[PDB]
Structure formats: C-alpha cells, structure tokens
C-alpha cells in the first residue's frame, strides 16, 4: 500500500460523501501499521456546525474498531491545489496520530503535497497543555 494506492482509496471514499449543502465532496483513506485501510468521507447537516469531515470520519471509524496505530493518511477533493485539511481535522489528527504519520494531500488533478502530522499543525494544543 504505497501513497499512490492509498490515494486511489481516498478517491473512492470521496464518492460516498453526503454533501448536499456544499456540493463539495471529500475523501480520505487511513492506513494502519498492520496495513488495514479505513475510508472516510464528509457528511453534512442542514445545521452546518454539525457537518463532519472525511479525515475525521476515517479516524473515528478506525479508533472505534480498536485500531490506533497508523502510518499514512491520504485526503482528496476537487480543489485547485492539494486539499487543505481544515483546522478541526488537523486538531483531531494531531491527537489521534503519532507525529511521524505521513499525511498525503491531493486533488483530482495530480497535485500532491506530503507532510508529517507535526508539520500539519506545529505545536498543536495538546493534553500536556491541560496537565
């Protein structure tokens, strides 16, 4: 499961999105250390605050199944450049993924940006800050 293949997983996951308000579909594929893939997509709500993102859908799915060791996360959307995870997703990612996990961002036209969890949100607010 290289990043190329993980991207195709996120592209497929994108087609499952429920986004009738923004008409903006997002897909994500999370790869565990054991090689298992969890797909995620954004799921909207008439009350915008309750919309959930593809990145978080995939992570929530994994953690709920007991999988908490990851190696890579691919995210895709029909944006101008590689899709940029929103702050809420970066925050959840910084909590649920170890700082070494690779984050692969792409769009639907071959644009690819790769960065680590730490780079996605440097100095992220964490539990250590609470105590």
């Amino acid at each position: 499961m290289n990043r190329q293949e993980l991207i195709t997983e996120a592209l497929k996951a994108r087609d499952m999105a429920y986004a009738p308000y923004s008409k903006f579909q997002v897909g994500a594929a999370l790869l565990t250390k054991d090689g298992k893939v969890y797909r995620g997509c954004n799921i909207e709500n008439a009350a915008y605050s309750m919309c959930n993102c593809a990145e978080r859908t995939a992570l929530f799915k994994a953690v709920s199944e007991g999988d908490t060791e990851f190696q890579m996360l691919a995210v895709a959307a029909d944006t101008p450049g590689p899709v940029s995870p929103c702050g809420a997703c970066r925050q959840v990612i910084s909590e649920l993924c170890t700082k070494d996990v690779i984050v692969v961002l792409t769009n639907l036209q071959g644009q690819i940006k790769e960065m680590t969890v730490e780079e996605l949100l440097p100095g992220a607010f964490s539990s250590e800050d609470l105590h």
Copy 2:
C-alpha cells in the same frame, strides 16, 4: 436483533471509547434495515470542541460505508437514568435517520427509555428550512 441485543452491542461499543479527559465513556449501536450493526463510541480531544460522540461515530461509519437505511439506534453510558443524546447528536440523528427510526436509550443499570427520531428533536431544523 431485538432492542435487548442491540443494547448489548452498544455496551460492547462503549468499551472502545477514547475519553481520557471526561473519563465518561459512551457506546452506541446502529441497526440498518438489512440487519447490519455499526458500533460507535465517543472519541475525545484535548481541545474539547473536537470531541465526537458515540451516536455520531456509529452514524458516520454507516453512511460512509453506503448504508443509509436504519431501523434502530441504541445508546448507553454510566449515567443516573437512560443516557440523553446531546443536542449535536440529536441534530445529526434527525438528518441521517428517517423520523420512524427507534432510539433506545439506557444506562448501565437497566434504565430504558424508547423514543422516535421525531420525538428526540421535535421540529428539528432541517434542509427544508434552508430551501
């Protein structure tokens, strides 16, 4: 899969919760029309706003897999009476579940309250309100 059995599913799902800040674990089990069960649990974050609930974890998991027809949702937590879904969950439920879906609420001591999606959030804000 009766409500008794769906409750045991939610009780198991509760043990998967990642809740190091509140130490309050919640479990949920969503039953589709075809009899498939999706488990969900709350997943917290040092930045409280980003915490996700068991009800929504289960629903997000189902919808992302392509399952959008449900019949029942069980929710469980160690509360005094049947656990009460927070407003955000009721909002997502009212969007992703048809008004006839049965919502079963319970705690860890046999308290059981049953209600429909419509009753969970009567006159819920919806897409019809946007247009």
Copy 3:
C-alpha cells in the same frame, strides 16, 4: 422589553450575519434579568464545522461580559415557520439558561412560537450526568 420588542432586536441582529456559504442569515437577541440586550448572528466559515449560530453568538457575548442571568431569548430567520434552533444551540441554551427562561421563535412573516428552555430540549444531557 416585551417579546415584541425583543423580536425587533433579533431582526436587527440578523442583518449583521456573516453567512456567505448558506446565504441564510439568522438573528438573536438575549434579554438579561436586568433588562440588558445582547445581539447575536450566525458567522460562517469555509470549513462548515466551524460555523457559529446566532443563538450561541449572543449567549457567548453575554457570558463573557459577566451577565449570566437571563429572562428571554428571541431568534429569527427567513424560514417557513418559526425558526428552529439547531441541536447544538439547544444544548448550549440548556446549559447557559435556567429552565425557566422563555425562548421566542419567529420568522420574517409574523409566525411566533414560544417555549421554555426545558421544552426546547427536555431531559437535556447535563453536568449532573457526568457526576
């Protein structure tokens, strides 16, 4: 400050809304026991999850100023019937307003529905449930 006058306050507050994504403006006016009025409006974000509602904007404003005793909350939007607070707002309302506070819901055509905080979200999840 009767409900009629508080409604006009919410109608004015609605014109301050920043809602370029939904084009759906909402207004709210919160009346304290001492007769002070706090206006609120929805404020959106390209990343939908981060949108904030009029009801919560008004409440957040009041609480931050040290005002925590309220008597009435008016909410208005261009909906078919009285605007329905989303679950997230009902949740925050049930926490920050005592159960006796009156919630006045209306649209832009004279539709008016009045209910108490308790009625807005009966048996709302609360701190008592955490401990």
Copy 4:
C-alpha cells in the same frame, strides 16, 4: 494599545471564563484597526463538543457588532509555554482575520510567541477552495 497592553486585556478576559469541566480558563483580546478591544473567554458545556474557545468568543463578539477590521489578537492561558490556539480557532481566525493580523500568544509566566495569521495556519482551507 501595544501587545503588552493587549495581553493584560486577555489576562482580564481569562477571569470571565466558564470552564467547570476542564478547569482550564483561557482569555483573549481582539484589537480592531480603530483601536477597540473585544474580550473573549472559553465557555464550556457538559457535552464537550459544544464548548467554545476564548479566541472565537472574542471574534464572534466583534463581527456581530459590525467590526471586521483587526490588527492584533492576544491569547493567554496557564500553559507550559505560550498557549497554542486549537485547530478550530486557527480555522476561524484564518477566515475572519486578514493574513497580516498579528497573533500574540502567551501564558501566565511571561512566555511570548508572536506570529501572523498566515503563519498560524499556512495554506488554510478557504472559500477559494470551494469555488
């Protein structure tokens, strides 16, 4: 109103926080181009997802009043180093503040980190990505 004075404003705003669940109070002070200061503080909810942060409380307050031109934002909390805005706040900040606005982060022991909005969340997801 230099950053030193804006910090004292955020320190005062911190004392208004309603944070009975985390016992972690945060303060913020937003300075407009015209020299007006809006204070903000975190406001929690038994249902963690609904908690709101100091940064966003201040911004929501300003925007609702019609003030949309800012020059600086100070944030303070009792953290080990300068308090780090959570992803949700950085997201709202990148939307409501122009990329040149100065963000001043500090704790209660003189630690000070200064950065621009762009630096707070480089390449933030924006409306341009939606269309």
